[PDB]
Symmetry: D3
Subunit: 309 residues, 6 copies
């Protein structure tokens, strides 16, 4: 069985980068829409007995991309692929992970069920919003971390990183920032709202680094940056693995006081970078390519949790 890399419509640049780092060409697939807005998927090459990897991120027009992904998975499954893996850098509906005193659907579980019934045997994703989403599946799920690439960017871009601070925008981000701080050996502050917020950890004359999993409307990071500047921090950085940047996000970032908003390219950012000069992008295509290659060859994937390939 050989590796076949297929791209959805959501993130073609990421898929091309991944295929480049594996020494492959993207698989021949036509993904369009009929006139009635129905997804049309045609696998243009035989995938019989192959190790198929479909790259599709939960971004853009989310329901359309998810439908395309499910249809591609099912097409490869009934075309007798030996194994079908969904490479989903940003997991759709990941924030619908709990009910919490509401008659709300756990939409992430529904997405996991639909991926399972489409025929996915393996999920590769990056920085799941909640790790418990791994339990929503009955198939193996590899949850990669952008932390190696984030630390690399911090070291090569913040000259004052030995005295800097790693700040979480909310309580739920504590573990990630603590890990980052430990690997950098730096002090780590915290922030949480009460319309007011409290920041704990000395930041005066010290660079603050907000680290968080995603920014959708950027209310969280903007409030955090406001408070960080209240406490007299010199410069403020925001680092995110998923730059959804929906709605008022670009205007808020433009009107905010960040020195940089760094995001990983799990979501295409070219358009967002057009209208916001302070957005920078970390390439994580090497981590995804390495994970695909290690799952194919049966090598350890947890090695990546601590090493940049």
């Amino acid at each position: 069985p050989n590796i076949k890399i297929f791209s959805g419509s959501s993130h073609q640049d990421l898929s091309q980068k991944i295929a480049d780092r594996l020494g492959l060409e993207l698989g021949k697939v036509v993904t369009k829409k009929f006139s009635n807005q129905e997804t049309c998927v045609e696998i243009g090459e035989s995938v019989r007995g192959e190790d198929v990897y479909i790259v599709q991120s939960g971004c853009g027009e989310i329901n359309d991309n998810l439908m395309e992904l499910l249809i591609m998975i099912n097409a490869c499954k009934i075309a007798s692929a030996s194994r079908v893996t969904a490479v989903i850098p940003c997991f759709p509906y990941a924030r619908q992970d709990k009910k919490d005193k509401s008659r709300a659907p756990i939409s992430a579980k529904l997405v996991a069920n639909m991926l399972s019934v489409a025929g996915a045997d393996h999920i590769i994703t990056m920085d799941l919003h909640a790790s418990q989403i791994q339990g929503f599946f009955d198939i193996p799920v590899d949850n990669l971390y952008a932390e190696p690439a984030v630390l690399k960017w911090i070291r090569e871009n913040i000259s004052e990183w030995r005295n800097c601070t790693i700040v979480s925008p909310d309580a739920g981000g504590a573990k990630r920032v603590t890990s980052i701080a430990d690997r950098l050996n730096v002090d780590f502050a915290l922030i949480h709202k009460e319309d007011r917020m409290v920041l704990v950890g000395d930041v005066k004359d010290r660079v603050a680094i907000l680290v968080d999993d995603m920014a959708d409307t950027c209310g969280t990071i903007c409030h955090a940056a406001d408070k960080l500047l209240s406490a007299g921090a010199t410069r403020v950085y925001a680092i995110l693995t998923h730059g959804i940047f929906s709605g008022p996000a670009i205007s808020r970032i433009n009107n905010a006081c960040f020195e940089a908003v760094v995001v990983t390219n799990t979501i295409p950012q070219e358009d967002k970078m057009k209208h916001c000069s302070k957005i920078q992008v970390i390439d994580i295509s090497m981590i995804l390519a390495e994970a695909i290659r290690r799952t194919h060859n049966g090598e350890s994937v947890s090695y990546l949790f601590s090493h940049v390939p």
Copy 2:
């Protein structure tokens, strides 16, 4: 257990009509989008131990409506509804029912699987494109027919209906037109392409009635009407249960020679009727309401196959 009728965003008028004919109010549900194009569903009333019916048609923005439908089904299922029924007047991806020498997905089967895994116990649909789609499910599926309402419209709108002709636009429509002709006791012609088409059945000075399950781009009915006028038919009618009317459909119908294009309101048509004066709408909300009420009360549903309620 009491009937609860919930509407999706796709066809709110149809749901309101159905709820009216059942003497009910639509269930309290909020269906919106987050900023990142993610479906948000909130059931505003308890459905515990109730007989929930969700009305949503595979029209408009199809993937968005299907995702909303699945999310609503799952929300009602994990909110402890006794039974959840998906009322899907136009089944999405119904035309993806077969592979036919292509590495194509059978998307209709995938939709059936997703409806099953969301937790639907019953499907009510109208004029499935292929009856074999009933076999795609492991739950009961009630496939209603618009034929009663179609015959009623023909009798009350075509004064020459005793001498008229019932014509199929393609080979695959033969059974429906034969049934219509038998119930009307009329001659039935046929049409099939060869860029040329052949029409069999005397139509000169006789009204032709094209009857078909759906019109998406209206190429089929337009070519059929062209040939019918070649054979000297006096007036031409098109009757359809699903008026998708996507892409060039409205321009083609406006430039065509139909005396009327009649469709059933399984899909909202107000916007299409705005730009096409020859589209008429048959109400089928009574058939849907009667089917919902008969499934709830345990009465025979196959009774509707031959009787207008």
Copy 3:
């Protein structure tokens, strides 16, 4: 994993031919009946870690053959075969594919479910009655076509095939005859009943070729041939992939006006050819052997759709 070919009792000649074209011996299996009409299956050789193919056609005593097939599949599955494929040249209950205004079971879906629960991982079949039956399974199904062999027979047996006609006995056979006509570049007529039938397409002094998927009682092809001779066609041919030939079929064919009734050997025909001199048999064992070999080696199976091996 090596190929293991096992034969059921239904079609031993076809299985022997397939094993010959693969350079193999039929697997050692004892398939008998106990005194109480219960199927006894004993695999006489280890199938552990092997690629098992069971050849059994939905013919003869259909329920007995289907039970034998399911029992063999389950026996090979719990004997730790790596993969079990059911090679079913004529699919049993394929005509029970829809409900259609009746409280009828979709027996084809039930057969698919039973094949899945017995443990089949792959289905190879020839000319399914409805392509939507592929959607009845959640495993891959390869639906081979007899069209290559049919065209070969037509070219090597009908000297007037460049001016001939390809006729469908009913509406539902349109696609197959159109494909045959296109590959032969000939005119294609059509036939459908109204006790009367209408034939469209010039056939005078031209050979008519009825092409259809199966003949059970041969009422369809006999009525079609009657009408074709009404329209003054010189000679009439019937070509079928499945020659069930049950009940009054042999008498009807003997009393009919066919120049030949050609069938493919998906069903044993020796006994039927004994009592009907006009039945000819096309060997399709090469297509089945090639499909088995290509699924085993991971080569493209859709290649066969257009090429005789």
Copy 4:
């Protein structure tokens, strides 16, 4: 929900008796064969929201009856019956319950899986060959015992029953005969082969009563009776819940030395009683009717294990 009793073709007399004892008419169902030996099932009445019980015994042409039963179950399930129960007085393939050093299928497990996937929610059966077959299902299975009716027959037919003996034909029948002996307060002998057999338990001048679950070829009971007459027993009785009586059974019983071979009517015996004057039949239709009625009303079914209704 009301009780609906449907009969298969296998045992129409038993179904009529059961329906009589419930004060019902048999449900309107047409069960025939097409010309190609395919089972045709048509439910002639609505079963929507009803409590359907299908009576079909694993006798006669076993695969045909099992296919008819599965098709009826599936038909009632997709016709929206509230609950479908398979009343299977003699379970087909029950003797294929284990592998035992052979590459043999556990056909009973396959039958259980097929009954589950057809949609059966409940199984009612009588004197399963192995009680572990109850574990083959994931649905509830009620395994009734003929012991009450057997004791009633013994008391009303063997005037010497207080001094009689209850003998098992093999080792595997020990539990049943011990229970019978305990409820009668009699001595219980045993028999097992070594071509020779040994009988333990004084039987001279005492009536021996062979008790066993089934007689297929009657080799077991005939050898047991031979040995019992070797040990000087006065008269020999055989009592069985399932009289399959296949192959040489009738000749063996006619040439044997039984005073009576008593069987319960889980299998039709009219034809067998025609050619064997020593076969008597115990009616167990009251136990089946009582079990159906108690499962419908939610009353205790285990009550029947000790009481004749």
Copy 5:
């Protein structure tokens, strides 16, 4: 269908209290061990057609209690109970909800799968460690909150509760304490370690109230109380819904500086209260009884989230 309440061995007092508040007697069940440490479960009364609720908490000898619970669920399911609900006040293995850079099992998902395959249709639990565990099931899960009873205890036991503080022992407890503070309208502090910890929120001369979901070894609450006394708080309270109190917990609490450690009786505490004078118990049996009664009657269960019954 009537309510049947069955008790496991884990928490018999809680089950008796629940049955008292429902006006019922505990169902007749024998739960013992064979000599080989195997769980023996015998339902002593018919549960056919009943609404069975099994009360068993993930406490004590956890694997033994979980096995007993699964065996009871399966026993009631194959005894034809209409519906089986597992009332699990403390969910076993709830802390194994994620992998987090380790080759660790998500044991909570495994427990959910085993509960589903045993046949549970409904789960009632109290204060799940992670709300995402609700997504581990495909059946409805009601996750009750002890917050109403906790607020009642605070108001009736801390006379200074209008000026008090609600403190979280770690970051992951933020939401619960914020909700408690909002319903009390009090300031809410926070605590998190760095061997050092930082407390944010003025506590001098103010009572601190640690609120957390569980205390296993009481390291978390003991460190939090140490820091709270470092910041000069007058008195310190710990409130917990699950008092596991394993290992060194009792010694730590005895050597700590709590004014009270309040726990809810989801776990039996009589033995722990024997050796620790500062443990108090909040009865939550009324919430569990009300939830059972509301699920049985189809009334709203989410009503309890805000109201003490």
Copy 6:
């Protein structure tokens, strides 16, 4: 894929022996308990793409061992092992294989379901209490026999084995002793209770050999030995594949009249052999190692049924 052998806590000696005979080291796994009696499992090496075999016997603290086994299976399954096999020398809850007129759970079926849902693809076990337990699974189950090793021990330890007797303690053990006798060509006696028991088969001055599948409380073998000494047998032997030896077993064996109680090491016996001088142990680790190696290499496993490796 390479063989990985993992040991549970139940039988570490057996796992080490098996790993020795395969030329491997035991896989690196930490299996402990948290303070709250919760199983903690950590796979210390990557199992990605490997053939994992977990050795764990249903002995000792049975529920704890079973939970550890399920947790290990699930851990290896979601760690992307190619195939996971549970090597279960003594199957837990195997004696709960039937209901038999009681509202008892079929706990063996529940254990099979839990093993399946944890993700086991293959079961290797030795001398299942009932062979029908193989039907409780839908995955392949290899049921090895200790008979080869038992015959080897008998021949090398009982000098009078050509004139000896093979005795079954109950009726249900008949098949095993008959097979042993046939392979030894010896007379075979039988024993069954009536507080009295009857022994059939001449044993005077002849060594009796009780052969049975397990001894839990040793009541069965002790009563059998008492009767055998009543019939004047010279010496009495008991041979068992599973020496559970729970409760009063050791005292009964010490007070009994066995010349030897031989057991196979499917359960650790060091502690039991400490307090009972007449217990001897047959090593069966070679059979288990050979079965593991043959399933890995795809060689015939049924070969072992008749040959000592």
